[PDB]
Amino acid sequence: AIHRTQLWFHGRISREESQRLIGQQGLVDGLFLVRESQRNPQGFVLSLCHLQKVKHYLILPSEEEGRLYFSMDDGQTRFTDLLQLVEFHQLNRGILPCLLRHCCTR
Amino acid sequence: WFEGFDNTFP
């Protein structure tokens, strides 16, 4: 949707590949991409590098009274789309160990 | 949490 044309979105790639993409870009703190979840069809994964380890955060869709939102914490922090989610965590950590600092591009 | 995943929250 609003995320197809974003440099940090990589669609359907695997966990092993998102790691290899971030690795081939230096394992810098703050490197990230968002991908379609492999296990979960309607879900997404935020893959992020911190302290030279790649971490993976499940993004799940839900509904409040007919309105779709996404969340990484069981609805405790809700976002209308992935861009809102990504933009927020460029400024605020929330449940993440560090900010989304450098977009891992493709 | 989500098994398989790093989400850490109350």
Coordinates of C-alpha atoms in Angstrom, one line a residue:
Chain A
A1 CA 0.0 0.0 0.0
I2 CA 1.6 3.2 1.2
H3 CA 4.8 1.2 2.0
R4 CA 5.5 -0.4 -1.4
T5 CA 7.4 2.6 -2.5
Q6 CA 9.5 3.1 0.6
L7 CA 13.3 2.4 0.5
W8 CA 13.2 0.4 3.8
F9 CA 10.5 -2.0 2.6
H10 CA 11.7 -5.2 1.0
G11 CA 8.5 -7.3 0.5
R12 CA 8.7 -11.0 0.8
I13 CA 12.3 -11.9 1.7
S14 CA 13.5 -14.4 4.3
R15 CA 14.9 -13.9 7.7
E16 CA 18.3 -15.3 6.5
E17 CA 18.3 -12.8 3.7
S18 CA 17.3 -9.7 5.7
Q19 CA 20.3 -10.6 8.0
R20 CA 22.6 -11.0 5.0
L21 CA 21.4 -7.6 3.6
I22 CA 22.0 -5.8 6.9
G23 CA 25.3 -7.6 7.2
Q24 CA 26.5 -6.7 3.7
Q25 CA 25.9 -3.1 4.9
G26 CA 28.1 -3.3 8.0
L27 CA 26.0 -4.3 11.0
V28 CA 25.8 -0.6 12.0
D29 CA 23.6 0.2 15.0
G30 CA 20.3 1.4 13.6
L31 CA 20.2 -0.4 10.3
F32 CA 16.8 -1.7 9.5
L33 CA 14.3 -2.9 6.9
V34 CA 10.7 -4.1 7.0
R35 CA 9.6 -7.3 5.3
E36 CA 6.6 -9.5 4.8
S37 CA 6.4 -12.2 7.4
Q38 CA 7.4 -15.7 6.2
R39 CA 5.3 -17.6 8.7
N40 CA 2.5 -15.1 8.9
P41 CA 0.7 -14.1 5.6
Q42 CA -0.8 -10.8 6.7
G43 CA 2.0 -9.9 9.1
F44 CA 5.3 -8.0 8.8
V45 CA 8.8 -8.1 10.3
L46 CA 11.0 -5.2 11.4
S47 CA 14.6 -6.5 11.1
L48 CA 17.0 -4.2 13.1
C49 CA 20.7 -4.2 13.9
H50 CA 21.8 -3.4 17.4
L51 CA 25.2 -4.2 19.2
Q52 CA 26.2 -6.1 16.1
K53 CA 23.3 -8.6 16.4
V54 CA 20.2 -8.6 14.1
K55 CA 16.9 -8.6 15.9
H56 CA 13.4 -9.3 14.5
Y57 CA 10.2 -7.7 15.6
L58 CA 6.8 -9.1 14.6
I59 CA 4.3 -6.5 13.3
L60 CA 0.7 -7.7 13.5
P61 CA -2.5 -6.3 12.0
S62 CA -5.6 -5.9 14.1
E63 CA -8.9 -4.1 14.2
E64 CA -10.6 -1.5 16.4
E65 CA -14.3 -1.1 15.4
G66 CA -13.7 -1.8 11.7
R67 CA -10.4 0.2 11.5
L68 CA -7.2 -1.6 10.8
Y69 CA -4.1 -0.8 12.8
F70 CA -0.7 -2.4 13.2
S71 CA 1.1 -3.2 16.4
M72 CA 4.3 -4.8 17.7
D73 CA 3.0 -5.1 21.3
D74 CA -0.5 -6.6 21.3
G75 CA -2.1 -3.2 20.6
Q76 CA -0.4 -1.3 23.3
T77 CA 1.2 0.9 20.5
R78 CA -0.9 1.2 17.4
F79 CA -0.2 2.6 14.0
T80 CA -2.5 3.0 11.0
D81 CA 0.2 1.8 8.6
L82 CA 3.9 0.8 8.4
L83 CA 5.1 4.3 7.5
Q84 CA 3.6 5.7 10.7
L85 CA 5.2 2.9 12.6
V86 CA 8.6 3.4 11.0
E87 CA 8.5 7.2 11.3
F88 CA 7.7 7.1 14.9
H89 CA 10.6 4.8 15.8
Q90 CA 13.1 7.0 13.9
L91 CA 12.5 9.4 16.8
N92 CA 11.4 7.2 19.6
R93 CA 12.7 3.7 20.7
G94 CA 9.4 2.4 22.3
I95 CA 10.0 -1.3 22.8
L96 CA 13.1 -1.3 20.6
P97 CA 16.7 -1.3 22.0
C98 CA 17.6 1.6 19.7
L99 CA 16.2 4.1 17.1
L100 CA 15.7 3.3 13.5
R101 CA 18.7 5.3 12.3
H102 CA 19.9 4.1 8.9
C103 CA 17.5 2.8 6.3
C104 CA 18.8 -0.5 4.8
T105 CA 18.2 0.1 1.1
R106 CA 16.8 -1.9 -1.8
Chain B
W1 CA 6.1 -12.0 23.8
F2 CA 6.1 -13.8 20.4
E3 CA 8.0 -17.0 20.2
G4 CA 10.4 -16.8 17.3
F5 CA 10.6 -13.1 17.4
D6 CA 12.3 -10.3 19.8
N7 CA 9.3 -8.3 20.8
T8 CA 9.7 -7.4 24.4
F9 CA 6.8 -5.7 26.2
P10 CA 4.6 -5.9 29.3

